[PDB]
Design a protein around this ligand. Structure first.
Ligand SMILES: OC[C@H]1O[C@@H](O[C@H]2[C@H](O)[C@@H](O)[C@H](O[C@H]3[C@H](O)[C@@H](O)[C@H](O)O[C@@H]3CO)O[C@@H]2CO)[C@H](O)[C@@H](O)[C@@H]1O
Length: 226
């Protein structure tokens, strides 16, 4: 494996299909992750974070295009209305300390260029596990049954629509989770427009405080067009 401690360190994995990023975007506190280059599996080996109410980092693995950097032949970006199926699998190892979450982060925007972010788009999160009392952004607007589980729907109207689905009870893994189900729900709520593009499907850990010991494994994402 290889260790990445750099703030914006990254590594292509799984033959280029996915990409792992240390992504310490909100703090100067140290953070390293040990990455398996074939699977993209990684363990947070070090996290000195103590960022209070603000996220310090989001080490993650993704499929598609993150701020312009795209994985290989992801078939993304692609219009929501042109998607017929979107699936993902993941296995996380929680810890008992720190303030963090284990969740998907999925980006959408009206344009195909993501080099400058997703302003005017949407950010769809799916929280599977957490600790330290951390909470989603915005406020809970509903609780709905989707893709085999029940989720609290949190919404925040920022520069882009922030929609977070928080499982009513924590879990440590999903196998072929029907991501299109969450996407359709956000569209029905008018939080995501069908014309918008799906840019990337990512999962990892939003870290506020600590985080060492968390592990991301068995990542998989597939997208089927109409
Ligand atoms: O690396 C390229 C660009 O990265 C930008 O940082 C972003 C992170 O890459 C991204 O993971 C993070 O996503 C946040 C989201 O903003 C927040 O609303 C949500 O609650 O949590 C997500 C995961 O923690 O967003 C940041 C910034 O939006 C840099 O800002 C940019 O300079 C850099 O080019």
């Amino acid at each position: 494996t290889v260790e990445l401690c750099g703030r914006w360190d990254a590594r292509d994995v799984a033959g280029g299909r996915y990409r792992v990023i240390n992504n310490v975007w909100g703090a100067e506190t140290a953070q390293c992750i040990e990455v398996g280059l074939e699977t993209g599996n990684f363990t947070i080996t070090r996290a000195d974070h103590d960022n209070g109410n603000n996220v310090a980092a989001y080490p993650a693995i993704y499929f598609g295009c993150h701020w312009g950097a795209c994985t290989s032949n992801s078939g993304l970006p692609r219009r929501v209305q042109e998607l017929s199926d979107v699936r993902t699998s993941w296995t996380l190892t929680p810890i008992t300390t720190g303030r963090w979450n284990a969740a998907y982060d999925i980006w959408f925007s009206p344009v195909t260029n993501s080099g400058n972010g997703y302003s005017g788009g949407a950010e769809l999160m799916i929280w599977l596990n957490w600790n330290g009392g951390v909470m989603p952004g915005g406020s809970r607007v509903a609780t709905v049954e989707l893709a085999g589980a029940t989720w609290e729907v949190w919404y925040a109207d920022w520069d882009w629509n922030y929609i977070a689905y928080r499982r009513t009870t924590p879990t440590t893994s999903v196998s072929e989770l029907d991501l299109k189900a969450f996407i359709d729900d956000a569209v029905a709520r008018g939080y995501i427009r069908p014309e918008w593009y799906l840019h990337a499907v990512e999962t990892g850990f939003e870290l506020w405080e600590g985080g060492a010991g968390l592990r991301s494994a068995d990542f998989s994402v597939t997208v089927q067009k109409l």
